[PDB]
Design a protein around this ligand. Structure first.
Ligand SMILES: C[C@@H](c1ccccc1)P(=O)(O)Oc1ccc2c(CS(=O)(=O)O)cc(=O)oc2c1
Ligand SMILES: [Zn+2]
Length: 94
């Protein structure tokens, strides 16, 4: 894949590994690492006409930022879980 796609894949794997161990501080760090990588990747795909599965992920990503900033902690938890799963499945299409 692209180098950026591999960076995202690796970072998703790390988030899953941290989640498995219950290391919530490391999950937070790794989600923050994912943030700029996904943002850049997504806009690259948009510059070449777009992917509906990518668009779906990004829609959820925006909703997550809106929920988190508003303190809507239940909506953040649900949306993060579902969107990170959509991204794992997307990048498993390799
Ligand atoms: C889950 C990630 C994602 C990444 C790509 C797609 C879908 C979800 P994300 O939403 O981008 O990851 C974050 C970002 C920021 C924070 C903050 C800091 S602030 O902006 O809230 O001040 C704090 C925090 O606890 O977690 C974050 C997670
Ligand atoms: Zn983000």
């Amino acid at each position: 894949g692209s180098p950026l796609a591999q960076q995202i894949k690796n970072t998703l794997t790390f988030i899953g590994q941290a989640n498995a161990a219950g290391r919530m501080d490391e999950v937070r760090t790794l989600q923050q690492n994912l943030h700029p990588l996904w943002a850049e990747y997504f806009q690259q795909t948009e510059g070449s006409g777009g992917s509906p599965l990518a668009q779906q992920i990004q829609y959820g990503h925006v909703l997550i930022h809106q929920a988190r900033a508003a303190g809507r902690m239940d909506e953040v938890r649900r949306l993060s879980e579902n969107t990170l799963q959509l991204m794992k499945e997307y990048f498993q299409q390799s």
